[PDB]
C-alpha cells in the first residue's frame, strides 16, 4: 500500500541530525562529517606567479615589435628581485613569482628566440598566464562546508592549508539485536526447526561499514522480560536501535505489545519487492527500525530505508545512496504491477562498449546469492509489468557494502 | 614513452600473492580475501519447508472436496509432531518444517474458511510450494572459492551454513614515508621555501581504505644514513614500501644512489597525464613504489598503478579497479596526442535521462580540487587530440577512495 517515497520522506522529515562533535587528526577522518566549515588560513597561491614557462613582459615593449633581450630570471622559489630595464623581458618558469609590474607571460613556443633578443608573435593579451594570489583559495573563504563527508578528495587539501585537525560529528551509535527460539549461534548445533542467525551479522557489517558505532546485544531470548530489558539497554546508549529479526513488524504477538508499550511505532506495509512490512518510530531516546525476518527483505529494507536515515542522522548533507542510470536490459525480466521491484542484476559492457543489464537469475527471496552474483539493482517502476530484451530500465549500482 | 597497460602488466607479472593466512570470525572479515574455499557442511535448506503462509495438505483429502479441520500447526521453531489423521490439514507458516506425509502446500488466497474446517478453492499440484531440502546448496559443495573478497553479500551466507570463522589471507603490510627538508608537518609554521606534506597523508588514507596495514614512518630528514635506515626497516616488515615524495623518480641525487644500492629499481617514464615518472622494483624482501612529488600525479599514479598492485598481492582474484563506460561529452576537451590523459570530469544525468560528462575545469596539476569536484576520470585515448561536444568518450567513475 504505502510507497517507498512516502515512507522515506516520512522518516527523514522526523529526524534531526546529530551535532555533538569531536576533533580529530586528518588521518582519522575518512568518512567523517565535518561539523563546521573549514576556512582557509592562507592565500593559495600565495602570490601572483607564472602559468607557463617562457617570458615575463610589459605590454609597452611588445609594440616595439623588436627583440626584447633577457634582463634577468625568476624560477620556482628564486624570484627576480631587481631593476627591470625598459625594452627587456624576463625568462620565467611555471610556479615562479612574476616580477614587479609584469603585465603578461608568453609561452616560449609562441615566441621564436634569437642570440640577441626575444622576438614575439601572437598578440599578448593582458594578464595572460598569470595566476593571481588567492585565485584558487582566498584566505578567509570557505573551502569545505559543514556537512561534507571527508575523503581523499578533501583531507589532502585541508592538510595543504596547514590544518592538523578538524571538528567532525560524532559517529552515530546504533544498537542491534535479533530474537527467536529458532535462532542459533554459529558453531552451536542446529536443533529441530532451527536456523543460524544471518540478518544480525548482515546488519552489523553494514553499520560498521557505514561508519557507525555498533552495539550488538546478540540474540535475545523469547521472553517479554528478556525483551524489555534489551530495549531499555539499547535505547539508553544508541541514537538508533535496530531489530534484525524476530520483533514484530505487524503480526499480533507479545513483542508487538512491548514495542507499543515503549514508544510510538508505526507498522508500514511498503509497496516494494522483495519485502513489504517494516516497523519504525520513536522510543524514549532513540529511533527504532524493525526489519522483516526474511534475509532478502531485511537486507533490502535496511539498504533503502535505514541507510538513508543514518546518513541524515550523521550530519551528512549529500544523500547517501548511489545515483541511478538508464540502461538497456539484455534479459526478459518478470515483474508484476502493483509493486516497486528491486531486482538484482549484473551491469556489464557489451561489444559496443555501452552498458547493459542481465538478470542475476531467479529473483525469489528464498535465496541470498543474488547479492553476490549481482552488482546492482534493476529498479522496476511500480506500475510496470514484464520487460523484454532491449527495453530501457533504471539501474542502481551497489555500493561498497556489497563489493 | 612507456604505456600504462605495459607498465601495469610488467608490475603485475612479477608479483606473487600472499598466502600467509589467519583465522577470524565473520564479523571482522569485511573486505578480507578468503584463503581457502568455503565448503558447505549441510544442505540448504536443511529440511523440506513451506514456501508460504497456508496449510499443509494431501491430494487425497483435497480431492474429497470438503473442509479439512486443522489438526495442528507448524511454526518457525515449532515443528508439528502430532497425529494428523485423514481428512485434516496442518496450518503452516513460511519456513516451517513441512509435516511428515505432507504432499503439498496451498497459500491463503486459495483457501476459504469454513465452520467445519477449511475449503480449498484452487487446484493443488503435486509437490507445490514445498521448498525441498537441498535445492539451493548441497552438502560438500563449494559455496565461495578461495580468492573471494568477503562482503555483505557472502558473509551472511557463510553464517547461514553455521560457520563462525574462516581463514583469510593476512592484510598486506605497506610502509610509507617521505623525505626532504622543505616538508613541514601540519600545524608547524611554514619556513621559507617550504610546503605542507600532503601526498603522505593521501596515500595513508587510501591504503587504509584498501584494507592494508599501514606503517607510516613520517618525514625522513635529508641524510643518506637516516634514509637508508628507513628503507632497511620498511623493507624488513612490509611487503610493499612506498615513497610518497622526495625519493628520486629519475632525477640524479643521493636518494637515487641509495635506491640503486638497496634494490633493483627501474625508473619509468609513462605516457600518461598528469605525470610521467614513476619508480618500481624489488628491494631485498618487498616491492617498492616511488611516486612523483606533485599531488595530482602521485594520486593518479597511486590509484592506477599501486592500487591494482595491492589488489593482486592481497590474494584477491577480481581486478580491483572500477570498470569504464562509454559516454557523451557535454564539454569540449583539450587534449594533446602523445599521452593517455586521465582528466577529471563530472558524470551526471541530463533531461533525457542519459549519462554525460562535463569537465571539472582546469586539468592542470597545480590544484587538487578537481578530485573533489569530480566524480570520474575521462580516460582520453593516447593518440586522440581534442574532443568536441557530442563525441563518445570513455569514463571511469571514482571509487570509494574519493567518495
From Swiss-Prot, chains A, B:
InterPro entries: MoaB/Mog-like_dom_sf, MoaB/Mog_dom, MoCF_biosynth_CS, MoeA-like, MoeA_C_domain_IV, MoeA_C_domain_IV_sf, MoeA_linker/N, MoeA_linker/N_sf. Its EC number is 2.10.1.1. Gene3D superfamilies: MoaB/Mog-like domain, MoeA, C-terminal, domain IV, Molybdopterin biosynthesis moea protein, domain 2, Molybdopterin biosynthesis moea protein, domain 3. GO terms for molecular function: identical protein binding; metal ion binding; molybdopterin molybdotransferase activity; protein homodimerization activity. It comes from the Bacteria. Binds 1 Mg(2+) ion per subunit. Homodimer. Interacts with MobA, MogA and MobB in vivo. Catalyzes the insertion of molybdate into adenylated molybdopterin with the concomitant release of AMP. This is Molybdopterin molybdenumtransferase. It comes from Escherichia coli (strain K12).
